[PDB]
Chain length 210, copies 3
């Protein structure tokens, strides 16, 4: 068939489908895109694969990306709202447009941290940074940065809550379980599937600190 | 062929296209899905057909479902925001995840009442109940229950208005024309195509 | 055959793809629809091509229309929220529904002015008028009219800002560069790719006034 995915429940690691060199993905992060057919490359829109001078998409490890999520690249796509016209004369081929200026403006890289959950059909605008552990609700339109462990939703996306207390977020950012050795991760599965941040932090501290 | 539907103006009854046993639909309700290609089955996302221990979708009679509407099932899909990580270790095959716990949690059935109009590309969240006669605006993201004859819109969806007065809604919920024999409906078409709720209510009692 | 567009960066003029006679489009306006596959005709939903008695869609020149934008036609599609039931008995073939009344109500034409930028996957509701120079943010749901040079976004779309001052907007509406002779447009390319509305206005005045 045309569907890249064999099952609605099928989630395929990002690094097994990405071909665009300007998409940088960490391990284990996955995309479950059955309901939109295409692989993850086409979630990332208007990203030139051959140019090193445009905004890149960087995704950390252990991210969950729902079906049909969109990452908008290419900044303003050549449209300048502060110029007289938003029409991209520079990029349509008409000899009457020869003296046009190039209206393309970059927005900066889009950076998704570790352990980020992106709900189905959410749209990430250009240049957005999403902190570790954040949650983007389904159908969000994310127009500005999202803090670590922050939950946002709506269009434009706005703050809903933080997943944990400030001291709990500080502990998680210090211990950075996503960067632990494979052996530590495997040994920690039961703890990571729980709310026991303090226990895991104290356990990590005795093992990793000196 | 590219499309389940022959025409943009073609609406196909739900009970002529649904195959998932966990989707229960009443008569005459239809889906007009030309602009998204697939039949109604694929509107209903992540619903295991073979299982009886998962949230079901129930839709009443006389509902109008616009193109590309989405009914989210499978509850939290194995992601626990209250756990340290939302990553679904239990459901990804890596030997390092062998001791993970199953984060799946049910949300409850999604229940759509009778005579509900769902606008194109609305998304219904898991476990939501939508009362009889409601209207879901196009592109709504319905995150909580909707009352009978309530109009909602936006993302998240929020109250816009009620279609009728409190007493008129009481009369409609009491007479429940959707359950009338179709011979009755034939004689009632002029009333149903009008705002004369009290008039029909009086005829019903008589 | 998979995609009407060869490349994500491909923008094809509306007047090279529209076949529906109830869609009227000006020159140079384009649709870049790679990420949704279909040509512009299928952006315009429920628009009977053969009837002269239904709401039409009119699009001025120099518009930029992003992928998957939706223009909702056919008004209420036969559903009357003020009737006892929204179910369109008139349009379902059933001898028990013979005495049903036609619930279809028109909303008026959808009119989109010159030089309008419509972001990807915005939805334009029936009967909406969008003034010259407006910007519709990505994923907007436009339920009401939008003023000239107004920026709107969200669902339902709401006022964000005006692009230019009241003086500058009045100047642009008066000078109407989109209607200029081709030779004037060509000579004006650099000015159009700038913020100097008043400078262009004064130049146009000296050249056009009597
Ligand atoms: Cl939205």
């Amino acid at each position: 068939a045309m569907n890249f995915f064999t099952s609605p429940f099928s989630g395929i690691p990002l690094d097994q489908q990405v071909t665009n060199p300007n998409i940088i993905v960490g391990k284990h992060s996955y995309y479950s895109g059955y309901y939109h057919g295409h692989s993850f490359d086409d979630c990332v829109r208007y990203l030139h694969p051959e140019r090193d001078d445009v905004d890149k998409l960087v995704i950390g490890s252990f991210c969950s990306i729902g079906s049909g999520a969109v990452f908008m690249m290419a900044g303003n796509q050549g449209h300048r709202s502060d110029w007289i016209s938003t029409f991209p004369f520079f990029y349509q081929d008409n000899d009457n447009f020869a003296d046009a200026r190039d209206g393309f403006t970059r927005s900066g890289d889009t950076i998704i941290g570790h352990d980020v959950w992106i709900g189905t059909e959410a749209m990430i605008m250009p240049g957005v940074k999403i902190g570790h552990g954040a949650i983007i609700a389904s159908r969000s339109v994310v127009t500005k940065d999202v803090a670590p462990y922050e939950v946002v939703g709506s269009n434009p996306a706005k703050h809903i809550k933080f997943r944990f207390s400030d001291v709990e977020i500080a502990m998680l950012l210090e211990m950075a379980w996503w960067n632990w050795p494979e052996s530590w991760l495997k040994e920690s599965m039961q703890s990571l599937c729980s709310s026991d941040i303090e226990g895991l932090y104290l356990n990590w501290q005795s093992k990793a600190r000196t």
